[PDB]
Structure 1
Amino acid sequence: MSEFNITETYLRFLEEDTEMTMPIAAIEALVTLLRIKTPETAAEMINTIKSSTEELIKSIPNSVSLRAGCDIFMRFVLRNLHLYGDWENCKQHLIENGQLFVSRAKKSRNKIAEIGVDFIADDDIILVHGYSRAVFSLLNHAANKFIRFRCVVTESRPSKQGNQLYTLLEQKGIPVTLIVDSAVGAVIDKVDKVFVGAEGVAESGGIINLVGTYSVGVLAHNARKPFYVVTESHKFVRMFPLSSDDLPMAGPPLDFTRRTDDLEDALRGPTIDYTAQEYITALITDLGVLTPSAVSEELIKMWYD
């Protein structure tokens, strides 16, 4: 007898492997939610997940990649309840689909590595920023193809992830430097291509991942380099700003409260930025390469109704 909310199902398998990421872990928790708890009626099933997704937003309010996972699972079970099976087969007809994304969204990243080959060409110095793991699997395919390139890793401050990526692919055997994020503007002229990855895509095409992907994006547009971004086909959320201000973590990005005893002072600003359509130029899906205008329409094609 589980409850699927916090850790009695969900945070079990987040300590199982750091190959599954946050939103499909919620998708893995949401598909097994109605699988065991199948209350033989179409009404309270969706009322179970509306209780369960809204407390899951309440569980971690500042991991809005989960909110994209909370978004499209409702978009999954809506059309899966469509084809009009009167809930008779649609109990089984949903769970015979069932384990799709643990067989399909797990193979997002290698399918990204199938079609993201011909971006990193011969002798491209590559600017990466933040642990967006689809980039590394694209770089895993690049080392396994023995195609020639180099790599440059920025910081990820304060999220520390840039120190991991230097250790992650030096053992793989790529010539690489870790650079500070402060030294982007004096180095970007030698840099030719640049790869990042969003935690979620907004309505105009959003980069809702890290602290300064918009900073390195607006550098690259004045450098006039193709600012690519690597993601997959389950990373879409309706949450869409008008400025570069999303929901913050807890407070406004200009706090002026004081240090009580020894409180952290680098952690006063934001941790999530926003980039509109203007500064990206292409992105990757499991559907294929995608222009920043088509990422608006496919995020609206089944979203208005």
Structure 2
Amino acid sequence: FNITETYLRFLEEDTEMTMPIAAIEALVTLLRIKTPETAAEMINTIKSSTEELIKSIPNSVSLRAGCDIFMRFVLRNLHLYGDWENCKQHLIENGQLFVSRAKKSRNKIAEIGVDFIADDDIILVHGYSRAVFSLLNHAANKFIRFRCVVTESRPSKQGNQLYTLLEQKGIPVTLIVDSAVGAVIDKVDKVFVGAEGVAESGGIINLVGTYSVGVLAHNARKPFYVVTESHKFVRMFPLSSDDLPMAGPPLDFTRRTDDLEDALRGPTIDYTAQEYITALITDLGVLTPSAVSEELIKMWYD
């Protein structure tokens, strides 16, 4: 019952409510029309909706992951096997409840993740994730001892936007280019990376470069980080150095030209392995090594 329109409505909004959250809410609303009890009508419709979303998707898996999570939750729901109405009611409730949970998660983050800041340590935030920014803000509020650093990111000018946002706060800001990151080995103290998806074990999807950063960190023996809230748990694993669903072509040796037509093509998306990251940042207590995989195992049983 319409998802393309919803997609159209949300792309550069975020800020207040997370992009994925809105999608989740929409999914919940869709569910709460055709009845979750009648599984014959419902699950097929859900599948169709997912397919539609995929069709509408260019360069993302996050939405797909969210919908899978939702499905899993729904599956879990009916395990009371008694009165069938209460479960339905609960299902109906869990949509805006999810949104509410986000605030709580943020609050939790503002209490557990504020222990990390030490004497003279330079912080560099990679990509675009709201949670990381919130954490940074909360650290600033606490006034431990830090430095907030930005990047020259290249999707649709994200890095610049981030820099501008930082400027609002007031904290002194200097920039790092995608190429000029190589000089950073010990001076910027700890390497932080924001997430737009967390897979099985160490697998994280963001923007136009993470793997290289991870490699650099490994070389330097630097502390590498994955920072997020709570809505991104995926069952995924790649085979090569990098493997993902792609709309932007990998190594597209552009056709013979003289007056310019199409050129901006390459690895737009980036993955990270298990070995490179030292710490995982989620509101779910204090979990790090391979807890997400365990969670997945608990959930799927497949």
Q: With structure 2 as the length reference, what TM-score do the two structures score? A: 0.90
Structure 1's 290 and 55: CA in aligned 2 closer, same or farther, altered over 3 A?
Answer: same
1:98 and 1:161, CA in 2 relative to 1: closer, same or farther beyond 3 A? closer
Alignment of 1:50-199 (within 5 A): 50-85=47-82, 87-199=84-196
| d(CA) in 1 for partners of 2:83, 2:50 | 24
- Please state how far the C-alpha of 1:260 moved relative to its aligned partner: 5.4
Q: Distance in 2 between matches of 1:117 and 1:259?
A: 54
Question: Could you say if the C-alpha distance between residues 176 and 23 of structure 1 is closer, same or farther in structure 2, counting changes exceeding 3 Å?
Answer: same
Of the candidates 237, 242, 260, which is equivalent to residue 239 of structure 2?
242
Query: Which structure ranks higher in relative contact order (CA pairs < 8 Å, sequence separation ≥ 6)?
Result: 2
**C-alpha separation between the residues in 2 aligned to 1:9 and 1:86?**
34
Give me the whole-angstrom Cα distance separating, in 2, the residues matched to 1:106 and 1:266.
Answer: 42
Deviations 1:21-46 (A, max 9, x none): 22212111111112244376233122
Q: Residues 261 and 249 of structure 1: is their aligned pair in 2 closer, same or farther, counting only changes over 3 Å?
A: farther
Answer yes or no: is the 8 Å Cα contact 1:134–1:231 preserved in 2.
yes
1:259 shift after superposition: 5.5
Q: Displacement of 1:155 after TM fit? A: 2.1
Check 1:290–1:220 CA distance in 2 against 1; reply closer, same or farther (3 A cut). Answer: same
Distance 2:56 2:136 in 1: 34
Identity across aligned pairs (percent)? 100
* Corresponding pairs, count: 302
1:13 offset after TM fit, Å? 5.7
Name the CA distance, whole Å, in 2 between partners of 1:262 and 1:73: 48
The CA deviation at 1:76 is: 1.2
Quote the offset at 1:243 in angstroms. 2.5
Equivalent pair of 1:282/1:291 in contact (CA under 8 Å): yes
Which of the two has greater helix per residue?
2
Distance 1:106 1:216 in 2: 30
Residue 165 of structure 1 aligns to a residue whose secondary structure is: helix
SS in 2 for 1:283: strand
Distance 1:50 1:263, change over 3 A: farther
Alpha-carbon distance, 1:218 to partner: 0.9
Measured in 2, the distance between the counterparts of 1:100 and 1:222 equals: 43
Greater Cα offset, 131-140 or 81-90: 81-90
Q: Could you tell me how far apart the structure 2 residues matched to 1:286 and 1:178 are? A: 29
Structure 1 residues 12 and 268: alpha-carbon distance in aligned structure 2, compared to 1, 3 A threshold: closer
Counterpart CA distance in 2 for 1:66 and 1:304 is 22
**Cα separation, partners in 2 of 1:13 and 1:190, compared to 1, 3 Å:** closer
Contact 2:34/2:41 (8 A) holds in 1 = no
Q: Name the CA distance, whole Å, in 1 between partners of 2:242 and 2:299.
A: 26
Deviation of 1:106 after TM superposition, in Å, equals 4.5
Cα offset, 1:178, TM superposition? 1.3
Q: Point out where structure 1 has 5 or more consecutive residues left out of the alignment.
A: none
Q: Structure 1 pair 238/17, CA: closer, same or farther in 2 (3 Å)?
A: closer
Check conservation: 1:280, 1:292, Cα contact below 8 A: no
Task: Describe the superposition over 1:117-149 as per-residue Cα deviations: whole angstroms up to 9, x where unpaired.
Answer: 112323210122111111100011011112220
Q: 1:248 to 1:195 in 2, by over 3 A?
A: same
Spell out, residue by residue over 1:36-62, the C-alpha distance to the aligned partner (whole angstroms, 9 max, x if none): 443762331222211111211221142
Q: Distance in 2 between matches of 1:15 and 1:170?
A: 20
Which string of whole-angstrom CA distances, capped at 9 and with x for unpartnered residues, describes residues 86-142 of structure 1?
Answer: 633322131134432011134433332222111232321012211111110001101
Q: Give the 3 Å change call, closer, same or farther, for CA 266–117 of structure 1 in structure 2.
A: farther
Structure 1 residues 97 and 188, CA, compared in 2 at 3 Å: closer, same or farther?
same
Q: Label 1:96 to 1:122 Cα distance change in 2 as closer, same or farther (>3 A).
A: same
Cα pair distance change 1:163/1:9, threshold 3 Å? closer
User: What's the CA shift for 1:234?
Assistant: 2.0
State the distance in 2 between where 1:228 and 1:264 align.
39
Q: Is the 8 A contact 1:200 1:208 kept in 2?
A: yes
In the TM superposition, 1:213-232 aligns within 5 A as 213-232=210-229
Q: State whether residues 158 and 267 of structure 1, in contact with CA within 8 Å, keep that contact through their aligned partners in structure 2.
A: no
In 1: Cα distance, 2:199 partner to 2:261 partner: 30
In terms of mean alpha carbon deviation, does 173-182 or 18-27 score higher?
A: 18-27
Q: Please state how far the C-alpha of 1:152 moved relative to its aligned partner.
A: 1.8
- Work out the CA distance in 2 between the residues paired with 1:304 and 1:220: 35
SS in 2 for 1:91: helix
Q: Could you give the per-residue CA deviations for residues 212-267 of structure 1, whole angstroms, max 9, x where no partner exists?
A: 11111111111111101101332111122122322242365222231557657662
Which secondary structure does the structure 1 equivalent of 2:191 belong to?
strand
User: Structure 1 266/193 Cα, relative in aligned 2: closer, same or farther at 3 Å?
Assistant: farther
Q: Is the 8 A contact 2:254 2:262 kept in 1?
A: no
What's the secondary structure of 1:229's corresponding residue? strand
The 3 A distance-change label for structure 1 pair 98 and 19 is closer
Shift of 1:209: 1.0
Separation in 2, partners of 1:92, 1:41: 14
